Design a protein around this ligand. Structure first.
Ligand SMILES: O=C1/C(=N\O)c2c(-c3ccccc3)cccc2N1Cc1cc(F)cc2c1OCOC2
Length: 346
């Protein structure tokens, strides 16, 4: 009884189970994340305070889907939830849910601010591809991969924090866009390889150390794509809805730079012969992920047989047994609060 203590972290009051102490801020922009020491298990952990998760239809959707999927997905590349809890005793008073997962050492955003060997890089990308494969094998297509959402460990191990996209909010937080596939941006329908674009957008950033296609708006973002990759072909546009197709066909045309140009040798570690051979396969593999047309873009499995990637292939790691409930859903606040609380108490 009374296993909770309140403590002011940042601008917030973290009320948590006694077992967790010396809490440090490591997130405001996951949102109110916090590093801790779990006295019981005797390791460090990450806790996340979902302030009033039922407060809107979006939050409630994200929080519900976060909750269920983390319970019944065990892959070494998808962040492990260890513990869920609420400080409040009753559904009437029920206000906050704290998620406790295991801790890594850093953002993928930090990793991007540094030179890596092809071994570390081929490893990270391998792992991203695994996690993604599991997700796809369980019918889950992500659609929103991003550095801020992939965490890494000193020994090169890597996890993904969210299960991505499943309408509107008012925050001081603008959603990041630079990693979203053309087929999603143009709202043309999609299949699993759609996260392959997102994977490539990262690889290229790792390699360039600058966000490939930045951009204030979905309009400005698409300028910056074709600017580099070139206007897509006829076959591609034969698929975009007449209303979209119009905007898209009537656009300053681009020849677009062939891959060697976009990614010079300057950017690659390539001074030993191993490094040079490697670089070329990095670029062959980049050349295939960064493809606007999903029709002609590389599948998830082929990516894992790619000469660069497959140096780490593992049947256990890749082809793990597939992971419940319908998840395309609608409810109101008092029903969402109902369903989040049920999922906590379990
Ligand atoms: O490792 C995590 C992490 N969960 O493991 C994590 C989470 C997280 C973890 C579990 C559940 C929800 C969010 C959110 C944001 C960052 C995370 N990071 C990155 C991170 C770790 C760390 F020990 C110190 C810092 C780190 O990043 C910024 O720089 C300081």
């Amino acid at each position: 009884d009374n296993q909770f203590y309140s403590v002011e972290v940042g601008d917030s009051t973290f009320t948590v189970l006694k077992r967790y102490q010396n809490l440090k801020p490591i997130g405001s922009g996951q949102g109110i994340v916090c590093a801790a020491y779990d006295a019981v298990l005797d390791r460090n952990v990450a806790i996340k305070k979902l302030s009033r998760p039922f407060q809107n239809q979006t939050h409630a959707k994200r929080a519900y889907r976060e909750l269920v999927l983390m319970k019944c997905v065990n892959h070494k590349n998808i962040i492990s939830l260890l513990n869920v809890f609420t400080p409040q005793k009753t559904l009437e008073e029920f206000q906050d849910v704290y998620l406790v997962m295991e801790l890594m050492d850093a953002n993928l955003c930090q990793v991007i601010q540094m030179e890596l060997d092809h071994e570390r890089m081929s490893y990270l990308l391998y792992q991203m591809l695994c996690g993604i494969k599991h997700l796809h094998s369980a019918g889950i297509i992500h659609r929103d991969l991003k550095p801020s959402n992939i965490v890494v460990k000193s020994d090169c191990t890597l996890k993904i924090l969210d299960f991505g996209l499943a309408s509107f909010m008012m925050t001081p937080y603008v959603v990041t866009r630079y990693y979203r596939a053309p087929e999603v941006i143009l709202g043309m329908g999609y299949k699993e390889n759609v996260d392959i674009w997102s994977v490539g957008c990262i690889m290229g950033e790792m390699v360039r150390h600058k966000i490939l296609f930045p951009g204030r708006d979905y309009i400005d973002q698409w300028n910056k794509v074709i600017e580099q990759l070139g206007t897509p072909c006829p076959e591609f546009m034969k698929k975009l809805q007449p209303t979209v197709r119009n905007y898209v066909e009537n656009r300053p045309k681009y020849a677009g730079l062939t891959f060697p140009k976009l990614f010079p040798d300057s950017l690659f570690p390539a001074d030993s012969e191993h490094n040079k051979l490697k670089a070329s396969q990095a670029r062959d593999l980049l050349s295939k992920m960064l493809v606007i047309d999903p029709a002609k873009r590389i599948s998830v499995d082929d990516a894992l047989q790619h000469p660069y990637i497959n140096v780490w292939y593992d049947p256990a790691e890749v082809e793990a047994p597939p992971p419940k409930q319908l998840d395309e859903r609608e409810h109101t606040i008092e029903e969402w609060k109902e369903l989040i609380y049920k999922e906590v108490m379990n």
